[model samples]
Target: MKIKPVKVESIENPKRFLNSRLLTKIEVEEAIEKALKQLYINIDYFGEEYPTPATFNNIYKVMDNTEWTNGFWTGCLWLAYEYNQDKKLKNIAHKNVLSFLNRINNRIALDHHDLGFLYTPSCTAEYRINGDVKALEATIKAADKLMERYQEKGGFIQAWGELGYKEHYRLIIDCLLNIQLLFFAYEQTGDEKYRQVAVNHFYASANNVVRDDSSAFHTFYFDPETGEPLKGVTRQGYSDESSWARGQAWGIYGIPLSYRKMKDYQQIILFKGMTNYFLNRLPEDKVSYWDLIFTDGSGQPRDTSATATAVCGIHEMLKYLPEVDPDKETYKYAMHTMLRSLIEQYSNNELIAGRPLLLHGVYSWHSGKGVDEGNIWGDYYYLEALIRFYKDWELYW
Candidate 1:
């Protein structure tokens, strides 16, 4: 089905975020305060024991799960460092990192693609800026856990367990998150094995998870013994064949991650392919629904989380093409325009006082139903991009 891209061009609210100028420092600070308060209520003091014990939310989300959620915290903490070098935010971040370490210690295999979110924000970033030995130790351990999940056959790190005692290992676009964790581990341990594991995983992800036309699958089941492709599964998004917008965002972010870690011509080309496709597919408002496929083209409501994630990913991609390779100016400009569009269109300044910076976001792609209206992940990513923007406009947008 040929789905023509439709741009929602009408401006419903004059206060739309995308049309506004970059927020002032004081405005940004106020936003941060709102975020910090929300974090304490929803994540920190709540003790990861929310939405019931059966479904593991942040309660046992481990490194990868907490990473994005903590991105806001990390971004805020980073801002706190840059502004005043305050020990309070430093202390808060350090404590959270330790909490993450303790949670992961002696636990199950950290066999997923996103431990960077968990450990980097919770541990590695803290250590990087503050030289905290405890954070360093925790990050190393988390890295070790990630490295161990590598399946020789599949190349990429395994994410979910095989369905019904089927030794079919799985990998997902989320593996792009592992590159940073693995590279950080390589930097820390000087282990060629770690570096090779990450590199091979990157190749396997491109070969298996990323589709021929550029849309990515949520997970690719593999024969654990041989690392061969078995089938693809969709747990988070709509269905196997449907194009999940967030999954597409994962591809956009994931490819740049590969470009940063593995300096290869093929990786660069793949990055360009994904970027061009995304730029072409995304609408003028720069917001995407849960699924982008035309057949199932029924809009599953505009999701702020997908938008926030895409913005951050676009910002990161723009960051790489310039300093790393100057020839990629077209992509850099495209990313900047879209990113600015997101800030102008979606962000709600009023949500800051309500302790939710972004007004529209979808969470829990699978069976979330009507529950995840104002998702924490979306809120964090929005703040994360904003703070990164304030910090020397380091973010590409």
Candidate 2:
């Protein structure tokens, strides 16, 4: 049986033969400004010292007093300021960054691999954009604290737990995104130790977290002493073996960004295969349900965070992809379609009421938690993709 190729339709936006329709730059820029304005106003009502809002339910709800995701809102504020030159945004972001000073000084809250998430977009972005040396000092100190979680025996950074805790040999694909802070530390200090730690952790993840088919595991458990692979597990996915959409999303973006910094051919190929796996499984709308292998229309929630993250990743990949590669068009079309879908369909456009920029993001399904809401990370990344499309792209990780 001969199967004919799917003839991709061409759109007029950019480089010929892309069927994907992209919003005009003005549309993206305007939307970003509008959304950021609404977000700033909304969060302002929540008062100062509010912990990170993980998701919304009629209003912004603080998920934890101090959790791994505390910096995303500050990151959002910094991005908005960078794009619009709004000093108000900068001041609010500065206030939020200052709030973290206590956390940094205490050093007890920096228990996980999320220091990059907590510091890069907030402190590192501030230091880079505003030349705030204090912000640089804060970021370096945070990165140093994150380094304590590295498992020297496993060559991987532990995702959670204290020094003598049971999770010493655990790693997750999400750490791939977090390690960028270490890379940034290396760049700032010219310290080979930071770079070496990052590279070793990346290689450890490359050896275990990624599957043969380019899919990824949410968690990889290993022998702490021998560094021998023990088992693959899932905390957020449907099953131990099922593909968690957002974990794949993390790798989809994280791996490419890693490749960009390291120029590793393996990471490049890994990005390609992971992109294919992610896109090929997407529904016609180009957004994914929480799990790739979920039963059809079983009322499973959608993960807009995954869509937004993948959108940014594909854009990053295109920056480094060769012009003549056949996959360029495919990736471009995918990026355009996904971005448009996010802006037009998933976003909270009523402006003044919602707790997020994008809606219907699931954090963890198995625990019966954080389902069917506007995730803070979703908002940050959604705005990020819009900024990229508008040519105001700034790298946080």
Candidate 3:
């Protein structure tokens, strides 16, 4: 049976964040302020009982180990510190970084491609904001660890697990967001090797992970021995051929970020194409379902994380647009509309003060599970986007 593409469009409100350039300076800050205020209250509620809040069910739950999203809470706290210059927030963020020292020193924990996500917002932000040389050293150590995941045969970073395993040649769209750690290391150390490795991985993903229509596959497989292309699949989408909303979010945000560091016009084009694909799939309220190609409006789960992350990505892409370019207004308007929609509709303000900043985020949607939950990365990216809109914006990744 063929599934018709789901189409929903936002009613254009002439006054609804159309003046994004103005609201960003004033109203957005108040929204961020309240969000962070509640976020800190949640942190205090945890108060050594739960070291890192991954997500919330009835209440905030901590991850047992240094899981993939462990850094996001601390990253959010770091941004809060930057925004308000609150010493307490800074000290708390520092404590979280201290807790990860053991994880940082252990080679086993650093084997994956997420070292950037693990360190950039926590340690890198710490260094950038606080001038902590030790934090800088820690970020470099993580960059070196991440570099080891690179596969010269495929010209891409191997995403997860042991190298000889069946999934050795696997590449995922999420790793694009992780490459900022390498780019940061290169800028800090003037090491061509780090930059070269990141460049290789970026181009490899562009060629392999992105489909002809500009939608991204969640995962792509390659031949283990020859690094030859094998297949593209989606672990988190409805089917291998479908586009996961989160994966599309990653490419929309991550590709433009790579272009920011590398100054590649080709990447900018890729960024624009992916952004258009994502914007085309959005619903009337600007939120997305788990899979653009698979969802029906009959009580389908919405993924606000994808919306938040896409907003951040679009904002980043807008920074690089030519001042008089034709696409700038369209992109800016979409970003503002999504940001406003998320702030008004999906935020956790009415529910509880400390549940999570963003609500209705999907962690995974394969086979119809893990839907309509608050995710830590969603909270982090939402806060990161808020920070981006602040006049005193600071780049963490």
Candidate 4:
């Protein structure tokens, strides 16, 4: 039996009526203006404009502070592109991309995983759309660095060698960005090495990090030589034994994004299989925590960030394989379930008051031990999902 889709307009508005109305372009412009007024200076490749807590103690802070830059640049560019701004926003985009590149090359910087964030969108996309060779070169270097960090035996990218968890060799779902890097490399050089590495990383993680149920592990411990799973543990979720909602969000978005690059049947299967498995368990609203089965849901509440991320992922995936895939409708329904829930239930003005985005987000498991606060990624993805809600035609999934 086919169930009717919810009338998106009927759900209780998530925020003040004014906020709900703010989802439009005029409202987004207003919010952008408000963000500028907040005087939030984002980090550049060579600037000291860290978002908060002047300590470069951990990558998460840097990640959180500058979390919105990618989306910010992308969002701004979209606005400028749509409105035909006289290249001012385009200039800002270029400058922001340079900042990320500079940061990657900073003398104080020691490489970690997120160079993809700094370069992939900024340089790669910029070059493709704008025909800028300098941007292409810079991004190529960033890709080289990411590829440099790949662990041979595990066949996955190492996330935090700086943190000394060398025992864990499997990819985090975020390695989806690395796959993008490899794809770009192949396009630029016509070399199969980059593509091979990307596929290997995908297979390594899909086979090891993801379960048959589609829910994902935060990280995996693997035998470096045999590429065999030694243990499965949660690095970013609520607990080692528990599911981390954001990590799951990462996987949901990540796999489909990987599928975008590879266009392989198996990759598509991986995306649909994991996505469908996860979607079947979704509540009427759709967003959720890291481990639904393993975690005590009634006690801890849910994660709006995860929901937001999944919504964005669904929108992106729908575009990539719209014709051949049988799962397209499922993608649409899951997207509606998640986004409608977020738009109707979680949003609060431009801020998403009650919980950073919807159900409020809980970041890194270690955070519960001490300073738990709003994460930038949650907010970034939430905004991203909102953008997709209104403009689904632009993305390639």
- Output the worst ten-in-a-row residue range by lDDT, candidate 1: 51-60
What digit string (tens of lDDT, one per residue) describes model 4 on residues 145-168? Answer: 777767777667777564325464
Taking all chains together, the TM-score of candidate 1 against the true structure is 0.76
Residue lDDT tens for model 1, 1-397:
1111222222223223334344456655655565555544434533432222111322222233232354444544544454456676676666666666775685533445556666765577777676789888888887887776677776667775643224546777777765677788887789988888888877777776666776667777777666577876665666666777667777777666666666665665566555555555555464666566522245456666666676667666666554655334444455445445555565544421223445445555576642335554565566666566557533211
What stretches of model 3 exceed 4 Å from their correct place? 1-24, 48-58, 164-166, 294-296, 350-354, 367-370
| C-alpha-based local distance difference test score of model 1 | 0.58
Better of 3 and 4 by TM-score: 3
Off by over 4 Å in 2: 1-17, 56-58, 63-65, 164-168
Models ranked on lDDT? 2, 3, 1, 4
Candidate 2 lDDT (Cα, 0 to 1): 0.77
The TM-score that candidate 4 achieves is 0.73
Q: CA shift at 86, candidate 3, in angstroms?
A: 0.8
Q: Which candidate is the best by lDDT?
A: 2
lDDT of 3 by residue, 227-288 (tens): 77687876787766667899999998998889888887777777777887787777767787
Task: For model 3, name the residue pairs that clash.
Answer: none
Which rank order by TM-score, best down to worst? 2, 3, 1, 4
Give the runs in model 4 whose Cα sits over 4 Å from its true position. 1-88, 107-110, 162-168, 239-241, 290-301, 320-327, 348-359, 369-373, 392-397
- Ten-residue stretch with the least lDDT total in model 3: 1-10
| lDDT tens readout by residue for model 2, 1-397 | 1111222222223332156666787778777877786677666665554434456463466543387776877877877887879888788788777767667888757788888888887888888887887788888998898898887777788888655345656888989888999999999999998988898888888777877777778888878767777877766888776788999899889988787778876676778777788877676577888898763465788888998999999999888888887678878887888888777778886666436778888887877667887777888889888877876466877
TM per prediction: 0.76, 0.92, 0.90, 0.73
Instruction: Pick the TM-score winner.
Output: 2
